Amino acid sequence: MMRNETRVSTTENVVNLSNYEDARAKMSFALDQEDWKSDPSQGGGIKITH
Amino acid sequence: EQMIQSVDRTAVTGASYFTSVDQSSVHTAEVGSHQIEPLKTSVDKPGSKKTQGEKFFLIHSARWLTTHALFHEVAKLDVVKLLYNEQFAVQGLLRYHTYARFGIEIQVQINPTPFQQGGLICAMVPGDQSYGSIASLTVYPHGLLNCNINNVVRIKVPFIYTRGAYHFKDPQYPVWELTIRVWSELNIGTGTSAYTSLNVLARFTDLELHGLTPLS
Amino acid sequence: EQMIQSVDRTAVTGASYFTSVDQSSVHTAEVGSHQIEPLKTSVDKPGSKKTQ
Amino acid sequence: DDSGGFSTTVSTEQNVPDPQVGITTMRMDVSGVQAPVGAITTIEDPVLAKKVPETFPELKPGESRHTSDHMSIYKFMGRSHFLCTFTFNSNNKEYTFPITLSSTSNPPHGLPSTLRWFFNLFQLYRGPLDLTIIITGATDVDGMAWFTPVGLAVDTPWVEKESALQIDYKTALGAVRFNTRRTGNIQIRLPWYSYLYAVSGALDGLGDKTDSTFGLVSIQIANYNHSDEYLSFSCYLSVTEQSEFYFPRAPLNSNAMLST
């Protein structure tokens, strides 16, 4: 006999488009949920972060 | 060389009085085992000879009046013949056995109001209330019931008999004989109850049972 | 477990030239034993091949 | 011996439960150069019938190539099997069905195909079960289901009618409240609330109407309906790890295995 219950709170299925912590994706089109590495080869090492 | 085992031919089984000799035998096939109850359906101790045979039974009810004179005999009863009756639980042990050897525990109870006065004697006489003296009933295992002092006496006696055991289906003579004589007369005033009730309880002690028999 | 013994089936008995093979046998039942005579009824030596 | 018996022979245990794991594994050869003495035997002796059989030279089967063991009860009957189905036809009605283990009750008013087979393999059942109900049909229908133990007052079984009980009596037994638009399924335990030790399936007489049922689930619906739409419920039973099974029994014959 399992005992696992949660209460469904407010703001049910609401899209928050204001920050990355709520706009990041839940699933992925990519095979094997894969990730991509860094390749600063043809960009001369000039990378913008700010 | 391998040995091929076979079934055993001769064996003796039974439970302590039935003996079965078999020319063609086989081993017993048992499933499971004996289990205890962690949640018991009955919390008393289980039944045995002690809780069925050694237990008080009401055997007689008399009544002591103001019209009974001195040395009048209120109760004259055979103790062992009255316990040999279908209405008591000890019958289920005695109906199937033949001989027995036992001790007797007697308890005699009365209930006077404290406006009454008088006395009784309750002696255990073995065998026969013979030609002996009524005034010497304090030689036997006895008890005195006084309306001022007490209302319960209790007596414990061993097995006293001319043979080694007692035969219920065809007895020789009664083992014990309880008598209850008027030791001092019952006197009342105007309006007081002219009676008092009496009850005799009896039970076996150290009950031995021999020779279980089919015929009753 | 107790073992119930039974009677023996095969046995060979006899006295030195008669041989008896038995399919259904039983033990011998003997009473008493051989006794000597403290007051002898005959004082010579007993008969044998030598004295005959 | 406690009971006073005596014997010259040896009494051995017959038909010990679970003698072997039903997966291919290793706990050279199985039979070999030695002559098979286990080919010839006597079946009337329970001591000689426990001898391991061999007649031909063999070798070990190896190991299987799937992890689970399908020959266990807690994995076979962990799969949820069909129990019953029924439809509603009007408003504010109440339906009541018991979970009866008895083989006398034929389906639709009894255990169907696989559950009728399983609960007649053994004698005694003790423990909690595992009910899943599935809603098919209408929407915006509010329903309530509760559980009544055996020996207490409840409406008539297998009959859809108005409820003669009050809301204070229904919600005191513990109830769930659902809506047919949001969930479509309820996976609910069933507690072991009985006054007796265990329930049995293979009984007759007045022991069949007392010691077979262990619980009783009933459903009441409201807000049904609008003009033309059906509403169907279907029930499914699974078994838990808290449940126990005792004393294996001869299985049902090929004419008692019935279905819906």
What is the domain count for chain D?
1
The number of beta carbons lying within 10 Å of the beta carbon of residue B21 is 11
Radius of gyration of chain B (CA): 26
Residue A48 φ/ψ, nearest 5 degrees: -100, 130
Burial group, residue C25, by CB count within 10 angstroms (0-12, 13-18, 19+): middle
Which residue is associated with the tokens 């003790």?
Answer: D126
Which has the closest alpha carbon to B104: B116, B86, B119, B122?
A: B122
Which has the closest alpha carbon to B205: B138, B107, B95?
A: B107
- Chain A environment of D242 (Cβ under 8 Å): 1
3-state secondary structure of A32: helix
CA distance B119 to C35: 84
On whether the CB atoms of residues B72 and B65 are closer than 8 A, the answer is no
**Which amino acid type is present at position D254?**
S
Q: Which chain B residue has its CA at the smallest distance from D1's CA?
A: B15
Measured distance between the N- and C-terminal CA atoms of chain D, rounded to whole angstroms: 52
Domain range for D112 is 1-260
Q: Which two tokens stand for residue B128?
A: 């026969």
Please calculate the CA angle D214-D220-D222 and round it to the nearest 5 degrees.
170
Separation in Å, CA of D21 to nearest CA in chain B: 20
Q: How many CA atoms lie within 13 A of D108 on its CB side?
A: 9
Q: Which two tokens stand for residue C45?
A: 């030596």
In units of Å, what resolution does this entry have? 3.0
Contact B12 C2 (CB under 8 A): yes
On whether the CB atoms of residues D100 and D106 are closer than 8 A, the answer is no
On whether the CB atoms of residues D117 and D251 are closer than 8 A, the answer is yes
Measured distance between the N- and C-terminal CA atoms of chain A, rounded to whole angstroms: 54
- Chain D environment of B38 (Cβ under 8 Å): none
Which residue is associated with the tokens 């029994």?
Answer: D249
The separation between CA D9 and the C-alpha centre of its own chain, rounded to angstroms, equals 41
3-state secondary structure of D207: helix
- Chain C environment of B10 (Cβ under 8 Å): 4, 6
The domain spanning residue D107 has which CATH number?
2.60.120.20
Does residue D39 belong to the interface with chain B, where contact is any CB pair within 8 Å?
no
Which has the closest alpha carbon to D127: D200, D191, D208, D209?
A: D191
Which has the closest alpha carbon to D95: D139, D143, D161?
A: D161
Long-range CB contact pairs, B190-197, < 8 A, 24+? B192/B113, B192/B115, B192/B116, B193/B113, B193/B116, B194/B65, B194/B66, B194/B67, B195/B63, B195/B64, B195/B65, B195/B66, B196/B63, B196/B64, B196/B110, B196/B111, B196/B112, B196/B116, B197/B61, B197/B63, B197/B64, B197/B110, B197/B111
Q: Which two tokens stand for residue A40?
A: 């600063």
DSSP letter at D59? Answer: B
On whether the CB atoms of residues D176 and D144 are closer than 8 A, the answer is yes
Task: Identify the structural domains of chain B with CATH numbers, from first to last.
Answer: 1-216 (2.60.120.20)
